[model samples]
Target chain A: PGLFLTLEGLDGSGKTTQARRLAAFLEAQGRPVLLTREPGGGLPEVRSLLLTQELSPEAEYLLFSADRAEHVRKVILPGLAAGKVVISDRYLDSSLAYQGYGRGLPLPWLREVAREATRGLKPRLTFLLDLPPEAALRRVRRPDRLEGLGLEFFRRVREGYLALARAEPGRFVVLDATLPEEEIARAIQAHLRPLLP
Target chain B: PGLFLTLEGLDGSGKTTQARRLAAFLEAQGRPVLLTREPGGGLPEVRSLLLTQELSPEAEYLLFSADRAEHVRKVILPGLAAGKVVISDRYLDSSLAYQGYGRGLPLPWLREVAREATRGLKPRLTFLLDLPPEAALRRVLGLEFFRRVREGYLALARAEPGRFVVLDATLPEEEIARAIQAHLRPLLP
Candidate 1:
């Protein structure tokens, strides 16, 4: 496989679970899979990333961008250099959906900054788990700070995620989160297998 | 003649002697002169600026900028508007020379930051008192800090004294003090 896949969606959409499933499936198929999460994994110094979910939205947004800087310099380059499939649990798209579209931070600013932060590193494929806010909320246990935001915000987040999928049709695959977990994972495996070597 | 001039230098460089003499000459010529020292004119905030110099350099620098911002916004602007000669003992320029140049901080960075801190206001003329490093050191009671620093600051003081009046620090105190008064003759008595 060429490289770089990402799973991005709101909390409780089971994106993390599906990311693990996909990576394990890919590994069993003999692909070298490196599964990690945004603001974490090998980039340990970027503690600011964890603080974003704890702080006020604007402070959270800026800290996340700073964290992205340190993260890319530390993790992504080394993994890509070794030619492994670098699968991130949540990437730049998550920030856009949560902060730019949902929290009403300037979208154009967010796009420009995300481009800068990632240094224009586009994923080969993005698997977005789509569910209505209520359904997603129902499934997630012990909602975190962002998940606690009300319906109005989650609706914007859903729209934002959908908008990104529409913009990058070739690269983004939307999965039905309402589907049973086994079936949803199978659908992902089916879509992703053709793209792999 | 309309410009307000303040002489900033070391302890024996004769700020008080010159300021008083300058005020006298100005009164004789019928132009109002307001020769004021910080903490002398009942300004509690300026006293705080004096206090901050004992702190860590970064912390002290920030406080100085804060103090100067308040001084300009509240004091200097008002004086200039009233058409009075408002001679301040020290201002943002002092911080640039002492903290930036003397302390070996990057000068251009200090300039840009000071521009932002002061919102671009500056003194019409800055008089630097040029003296031999050892002689300047002799005037102060404590020689501890300078003994460690050596003559490192003398070169900067010499090169920069044009905006400054580099006086002969070897002269007797009254004589040196009189020379400063004479320099202020047109502006002070």
Candidate 2:
């Protein structure tokens, strides 16, 4: 079994970039890595359903939970159980931020649903790419549910992410998205140095 | 604004027949009726995804909840608000039975998930077509999901006797419909 790592942040927070660099770096070191993203990571249908149509907070959360159920059972768990480093571009923190704190669903209930959905899986390290709503909006585009949410929603989501980080100091590393790309990656690599096999 | 009715049973336990007859009978008397089915009642996409592949218990249950969420919001509530009788051939009890008892998910968790999915909606009268699994299986060619489903539905009815009208689906077709009609007589204005 290997480390489970996750990247969390606003839409344009460079999670994709960081996750890639991290995975490549780890792989070069001869550590097997399983790179994945949320929703579509296992069942792209769940992701399409979430984005293409309007859904209630409860229903929307359920879809994410559904996708997560498969992701955990089929992807992440298998990769982790096989002693490979598994890095998800986004994970439950996205749900906590977007659905829970942003849309006003209760965090406790969401966590409970995830207890069943994920079988209590949590990342050993959650790298938070902190970005202001305005900055985040600049890096995003398209006509999807997440993009349609606009500034205020992203603000709340960012707040939720930071709040979550504050609560779990041991598991989170808050990074400034304004930092140089290489600088951010360096910080991530340094943090991962000791934890790496 | 309107009565919510549901017919629950194993596949081929005469639920589809009874649901049709009940809706047809009620509507013939000038009562507005909206007939719906589960998994795809509101979102055909959800149903397609659910049936197309095998999924974990949590994933399967959530897809059902997702579709039920839309069904409750876009179908069931709208019909009820417009004063039309909303009748579903299958509802949350199906999840309680199929996913909880049959697939081994927790009932309490399923109900909690439904709380959000259904917005706490429960049919005023749930007509349960009780049949032995062997008998029900003969009615349809099916798979592993329906194994303990009969007992699961029975247990649900036992817990909520007031809300469920447990009927024997093995009896004559007319007899079952007549009993459903009789149960509605008092609930009607």
Candidate 3:
């Protein structure tokens, strides 16, 4: 409800790890941090809605937006209302990245849908993890469905992420993905600490 | 996927049983049958996008229509292309019945959205298993959400069985259900 911070990067960008570290650091600082993601660990009823390899791209994108809506309504809003610091790993920015650029969905339409889903629930601060693609990929042991997409796909995904950062410089703190996990985590905390308790 | 079919009825109309039966009948006939229900079951990916319990009726209807576009693109056409029957248990008609008559969603809007979802995929044949509300409820062992929705569903299902089949399900249970099944058995195969 108070301040919402998000982490953004391509697959294997160490965003997840850094997000967890930031959450742990905040917890150590005695902050009531709610660590979550865009999909926000969607509802069980929504599980069947995930567009799979079985479904077409249009179907997949629509479902992602749907899942995102449900995620925001059921998960994000409640945490916000409870006055916890909501730190989501990814949010609307990811949609612009994966769907807008990577999947090549029409950018304007995707923006409109994302706008409706979040309903102005923009993050107060965003940490854009800027790392070379290979370095980012090497951080993770396994590839997700998006990661299974080869480097070419990830390059587009990264481009989408950077485009967002450039578009909204004030909201995004571009961090070197090359930084050690601890230093990067400290930088994220520095950004979050001032905005939060 | 295979053929797409949806079953639409009040809580106790016993349509699910018939849908399952239809699935078996189609499979036995060597057709790949995929049984699904509206606001659910066709393409897993697009299911999340549907308005669930919290949207205004207008928004809810639009979402369902949007879902149908995805459903047709992702599920129905592929199944039909494979030479499957594509029997949706409940579709645009169910929207007309429940949302239009029952929920009082605007009919014009319903028709437009319905057209979008079905893309004019009206059931080549629809089986509107009609019965008295009380009688239909009696056929089932326990009563559930049907009680909340029976009144709205009963009249439309009965009146429109031409597009629907208003079978008198009030007759002795086995005979009525069998009659409904018999109506479709030969035609489907």
Cα lDDT of all candidates, in order?
0.63, 0.88, 0.65
Error of 3 at B150 (Å): 6.4
Clashing pairs in 1: B22-B188, B23-B188, B24-B189, B25-B188, B25-B189, B26-B188, B127-B164, B128-B164, B128-B165, B130-B166
For model 1, chain A alone compared with the true chain A gives a TM-score of: 0.88
TM agreement with the true structure for every prediction? 0.51, 0.97, 0.65
Model 1's CAPRI class is incorrect
Kindly list the per-residue Cα lDDT of model 1 for residues A132-160, writing each as its tens digit.
98777677653344546688888899989
Off by over 4 Å in 1: A41-54, B1-189
User: How would you encode candidate 2's per-residue C-alpha lDDT over B138-179 as one tens digit per residue?
Assistant: 888245557678888888999999999999899999999889
Q: Candidate 1, residue B94: CA error in Å?
A: 20
Q: What's the DockQ for every one of the candidates?
A: 0.04, 0.81, 0.12
lDDT of 3 at B117: 46
Encode model 3's per-residue lDDT on A1-197: one tens digit a residue. Answer: 45677899865777889888888877887877788875534444434444255444444454555566666666777788887778888888887887778878777666654555555678888999887777766867533345356777777888888988889999999998888888888888777665765
Q: Give Cα distance to truth, residue A83, candidate 3, Å.
A: 1.3
Local error of candidate 1 at residue A57 (angstroms): 2.7
10 residues in a row with least lDDT, candidate 3 chain B: B141-150
Clashes of 3: 11
Off by over 4 Å in 3: A38-40, A44-55, A62-70, A107-120, A166-170, A180-183, B1-7, B17-75, B91-136, B141-189
Interface RMSD score of candidate 2: 0.9
TM-score between model 3 and native:
0.65
Give the TM-score of chain A, superposed on the true chain A, for all candidates in the order listed. Answer: 0.88, 0.96, 0.89
